Design an enzyme around this catalytic site. Structure first.
Site, mmCIF file in Angstrom:
data_model
loop_
_atom_site.group_PDB
_atom_site.id
_atom_site.type_symbol
_atom_site.label_atom_id
_atom_site.label_comp_id
_atom_site.label_asym_id
_atom_site.label_seq_id
_atom_site.Cartn_x
_atom_site.Cartn_y
_atom_site.Cartn_z
ATOM 1 N N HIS A 6 0.792 -1.112 0.031
ATOM 2 C CA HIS A 6 -0.035 -0.025 0.012
ATOM 3 C C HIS A 6 0.897 1.336 0.141
ATOM 4 C CE1 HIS A 6 -3.139 -3.067 1.411
ATOM 5 N NE2 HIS A 6 -3.699 -2.379 0.502
ATOM 6 N N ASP A 40 -8.981 -1.283 -7.695
ATOM 7 C CA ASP A 40 -8.173 -1.546 -6.586
ATOM 8 C C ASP A 40 -7.912 -3.073 -6.367
ATOM 9 O OD1 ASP A 40 -6.741 -0.890 -3.996
ATOM 10 O OD2 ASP A 40 -8.634 -0.999 -2.997
HETATM 11 C C1 LIG Z 1 -11.823 -6.961 5.815
HETATM 12 O O1 LIG Z 1 -11.869 -7.747 4.901
HETATM 13 C C2 LIG Z 1 -10.814 -8.794 4.609
HETATM 14 O O2 LIG Z 1 -10.192 -8.703 5.447
HETATM 15 C C3 LIG Z 1 -10.592 -9.218 3.384
HETATM 16 C C4 LIG Z 1 -9.841 -8.241 2.252
HETATM 17 C C5 LIG Z 1 -8.767 -8.721 2.097
HETATM 18 O O3 LIG Z 1 -7.934 -7.871 2.860
HETATM 19 C C6 LIG Z 1 -7.635 -6.578 2.356
HETATM 20 C C7 LIG Z 1 -8.080 -5.391 3.141
HETATM 21 O O4 LIG Z 1 -8.874 -5.691 3.949
HETATM 22 C C8 LIG Z 1 -8.030 -4.137 2.464
HETATM 23 C C9 LIG Z 1 -7.240 -3.920 1.319
HETATM 24 C C10 LIG Z 1 -6.686 -4.951 0.575
HETATM 25 C C11 LIG Z 1 -5.907 -5.553 -0.598
HETATM 26 C C12 LIG Z 1 -5.661 -6.762 -0.630
HETATM 27 C C13 LIG Z 1 -4.938 -7.523 -1.647
HETATM 28 C C14 LIG Z 1 -4.229 -7.087 -2.719
HETATM 29 C C15 LIG Z 1 -3.422 -8.012 -3.640
HETATM 30 C C16 LIG Z 1 -3.424 -9.438 -3.459
HETATM 31 O O5 LIG Z 1 -2.811 -10.320 -4.102
HETATM 32 C C17 LIG Z 1 -2.312 -9.951 -5.366
HETATM 33 F F1 LIG Z 1 -3.678 -9.231 -6.161
HETATM 34 F F2 LIG Z 1 -1.375 -9.009 -5.369
HETATM 35 C C18 LIG Z 1 -4.130 -10.088 -2.080
HETATM 36 O O6 LIG Z 1 -4.013 -11.302 -1.874
HETATM 37 C C19 LIG Z 1 -5.236 -11.677 -0.961
HETATM 38 C C20 LIG Z 1 -4.770 -12.879 -0.480
HETATM 39 C C21 LIG Z 1 -3.648 -13.681 0.393
HETATM 40 C C22 LIG Z 1 -5.014 -14.181 0.356
HETATM 41 C C23 LIG Z 1 -4.741 -9.046 -1.222
HETATM 42 O O7 LIG Z 1 -6.285 -7.515 0.469
HETATM 43 C C24 LIG Z 1 -6.705 -6.454 1.144
HETATM 44 C C25 LIG Z 1 -8.897 -10.417 2.365
HETATM 45 N N1 LIG Z 1 -9.581 -10.268 3.245
HETATM 46 MG MG LIG Z 2 -7.482 0.684 0.820
HETATM 47 ZN ZN LIG Z 3 -5.904 0.107 -2.623
#
Ligand SMILES: COC(=O)c1cc(Oc2c(O)ccc3cc(-c4ccc(OC(F)F)c(OCC5=CC5)c4)oc23)c[nH]1
Ligand SMILES: [Mg+2]
Ligand SMILES: [Zn+2]
Length: 324
Positions: free
Chosen positions: A73, A231
């Site tokens: 981020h 996003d």
């Molecule tokens: C509150 O909601 C969650 O926890 C939910 C969303 C998410 O967590 C995130 C957030 O709360 C808030 C922002 C983000 C961004 C990513 C994310 C971005 C890229 C990923 O991999 C790739 F695309 F590069 C990624 O992988 C997800 C994963 C390992 C299991 C997550 O995950 C996020 C997984 N669980």
């Molecule tokens: Mg955000």
């Molecule tokens: Zn973002």
């Protein structure tokens, strides 16, 4: 260098712009130069009488307040969400739908949408009784803060890029930006997707075949989902980009888990470097979150997004194939 950078900025209308090369070639100012490029490309400086020096001053201060020591981020992420939003704004099913104020609201929202992100989740900040969670009463803690910072920096010296909008323009812009950023809270994904599916089920086109959006509710809903898709677009990108975004999110989650370790808190999902399964996490991430969202977006703008849905599926296949 500047010739090479100028060359790469030729791809700004293209999905899969090498946002990481641009970060190198611009001297860790990807957000500033991609925003600049996009504002010139959409003729926004002249439309909104934004002085070029004010725009650059603001963009650099905004970029500074992304954390260079946060693996995912950071300002590269912001640059990539701005640039992805810009591609999605140009999609044919949306032609001439959105005003220039809404286009600016979306691009601005993308730019600020994660500013001053500390590299840990809302839940971690709720769970460690952080000042941020205390400030914001546990609801959209980061997203409120990204908004608060994004707008506040407009007040720094020669930073108000909206100084020549009308009062009504500023008012409408501010509300649209808030409505969009607050919708990047992942705890609102299921609802936002649910409402997006409902829109697809009841979709209406114009005589030009372009999407018909009667009212604020439907228009902001499309911009909310657009920036949300941007996003969540890492797994729709060329695999060399996708992989590097995964390396970055994994390192950030791992660092959070370590902080969860030195606190005796339990480790959140996917945050334990000694019990990781990166490939299966990406596949689950695609299957339950990313692909449901983008399939729905693809139906909304059908067939404008087919090549993006293609790459997502190829990338999903590939992450599967590397599973033991
Ligand atoms: C509150 O909601 C969650 O926890 C939910 C969303 C998410 O967590 C995130 C957030 O709360 C808030 C922002 C983000 C961004 C990513 C994310 C971005 C890229 C990923 O991999 C790739 F695309 F590069 C990624 O992988 C997800 C994963 C390992 C299991 C997550 O995950 C996020 C997984 N669980
Ligand atoms: Mg955000
Ligand atoms: Zn973002």
């Amino acid at each position: 260098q500047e010739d090479v950078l100028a060359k790469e900025l030729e791809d700004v209308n293209k999905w899969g712009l090498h946002v990481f090369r641009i970060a190198e070639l611009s001297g860790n100012r990807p957000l500033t130069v991609i925003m600049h490029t996009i504002f010139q490309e959409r003729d926004l400086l002249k439309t909104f009488k934004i002085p070029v020096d004010t725009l650059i001053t603001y963009l650099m201060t905004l970029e500074d307040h992304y954390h260079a020591d946060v693996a995912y981020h950071n300002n590269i992420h912001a640059a990539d969400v701005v640039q992805s939003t810009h591609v999605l704004l140009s999609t044919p099913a949306l032609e001439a739908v959105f005003t220039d104020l809404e286009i600016l609201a979306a691009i601005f929202a993308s730019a600020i949408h994660d500013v001053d992100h500390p590299g840990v989740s809302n839940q971690f900040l709720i769970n460690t009784n952080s000042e941020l969670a205390l400030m914001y009463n546990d609801s959209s803690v980061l997203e409120n803060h990204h908004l608060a910072v994004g707008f506040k920096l407009l007040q720094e010296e020669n930073c108000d890029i909206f100084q020549n909008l009308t009062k009504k323009q500023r008012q409408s812009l501010r509300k649209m930006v808030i409505d969009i950023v607050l919708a990047t809270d992942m705890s609102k994904h299921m609802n936002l997707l649910a409402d997006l599916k409902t829109m697809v089920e009841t979709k209406k086109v114009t005589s030009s075949g372009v999407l018909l959006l009667d009212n604020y509710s439907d228009r902001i809903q499309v911009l909310q989902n657009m920036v949300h898709c941007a996003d969540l677009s890492n797994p729709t990108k060329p695999l060399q980009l996708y992989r590097q975004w995964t390396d970055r999110i994994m390192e950030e989650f791992f660092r959070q888990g370590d902080r969860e370790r030195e606190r005796g808190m339990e480790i959140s999902p996917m945050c334990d470097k000694h019990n990781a399964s990166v490939e299966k996490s990406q596949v689950g991430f695609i299957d339950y979150i990313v692909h449901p969202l983008w399939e729905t977006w693809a139906d909304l703008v059908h067939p404008d997004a087919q090549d993006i849905l293609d790459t997502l599926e190829d990338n999903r296949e590939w992450y599967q194939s590397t599973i033991p």
